[PDB]
Amino acid sequence: CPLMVKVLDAVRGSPAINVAVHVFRKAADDTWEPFASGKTSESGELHGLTTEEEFVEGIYKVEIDTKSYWKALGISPFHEHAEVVFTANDSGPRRYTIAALLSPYSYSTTAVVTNP
Amino acid sequence: CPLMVKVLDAVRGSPAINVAVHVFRKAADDTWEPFASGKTSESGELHGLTTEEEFVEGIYKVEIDTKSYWKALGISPFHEHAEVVFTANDSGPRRYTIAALLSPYSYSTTAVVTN
Amino acid sequence: CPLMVKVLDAVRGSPAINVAVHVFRKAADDTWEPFASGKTSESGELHGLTTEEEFVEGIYKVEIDTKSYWKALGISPFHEHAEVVFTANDSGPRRYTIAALLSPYSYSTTAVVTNP
Amino acid sequence: CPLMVKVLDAVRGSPAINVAVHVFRKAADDTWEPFASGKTSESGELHGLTTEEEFVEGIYKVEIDTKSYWKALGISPFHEHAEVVFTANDSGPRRYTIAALLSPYSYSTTAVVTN
Ligand SMILES: C=CC(=O)Nc1cccc(/C=C/c2cc(C)c(O)c(C)c2)c1
């Protein structure tokens, strides 16, 4: 998959399961168009969002719905979501892993970008 | 003030100086309206964004222009910016510090909310 | 594997490859005994450190040699290493992933603990 | 002072208060000798650890007793402590802040080194 999302829970020491993720792409008119969405698995991973054909150059936003996640575990968290915004594929196709590590009042995010 | 932003650089081990920061408040129509902005100081801090009177409950977005920061240092970064979106709630503590720790391909953010 | 180590590079947006890792276990006399060691692969991962038989209860230290890593890439880093110290297997066998995300003056570490 | 420690809590969004911190200096025989210690303040900070005269170049270890912190809050943590080991170098800036951001199964640490 050219775009994968991995989410971990820093309170539990576990994958963050059933986390909703929405991906948008910036359009020519500067609006954020819905691009793909899904939920993390029991491993904290979300694959199958897009294809190399569909995943063209652009500015992408990966919105991780952390508030909804924490509001199931009895924690009232600080953030509404964690948003990751980046230019993709502008030197040709790459594979992207967007990883996030969640706490109620904090998160960490990183990217792993590989050239197939 | 009731809102402060602190930005640190994980590559150089220092404050992130002269970083542009824009704060937006979510309007009734679900658009982001400009609220406050500035550039971080030599200590990586931006104070004076708002007052207690203006900083009412609501959803706020703090956008940190990380891409320009890295580019000015001659380093190629991943993100367009770092986004921190949160609800201000009067039931909680009264002073909010949004802190961010920057790397070219990663960032960490936390909130320190005190009375 | 009951003990895995994953290391990422926050400057490059890549796995951190060829990172030396030394694992110690606290002995009855309170000294740190060498337990296992290895290097991260091209995926940033180190598997094969131990077996479920060998990986008994104890206090373990996972030392990630971050300074040696950064001193190959032309960065003089801040830390000597990143050390992760934890009690393992004290409610029976678990599988542990120790993950670290490295920058020259900072690191993040987390654990993912699963019950097979 | 030349050495400060700041500790934050990522679960509660606040300073980590009353956390024990021990600082060690590496001796010639490769053992860790006690150097300074204290407990973080209400602002999560520990100042007054050393002076410029005593804080010579060398390898130092800052051990943060995270396990006791979490246990006092009734939360089960992963780590025994958080360790930060570094070399003090006179060629670099003169003031070192060791910051740590704590969660039960994770921590982040950074160094802010300034003049
Ligand atoms: C409210 C004051 C305040 O936070 N002061 C201060 C001084 C030094 C560091 C910091 C914040 C540090 C920080 C440190 C780490 C390791 C992080 O991952 C993040 C997101 C932030 C704050």
Ligand SMILES: C=CC(=O)Nc1cccc(/C=C/c2cc(C)c(O)c(C)c2)c1
């Ligand atoms: C149980 C195996 C497992 O979690 N493997 C795995 C695979 C890929 C990434 C990771 C961890 C990523 C990560 C991501 C961030 C933002 C971090 O601050 C830290 C410390 C780690 C772990």
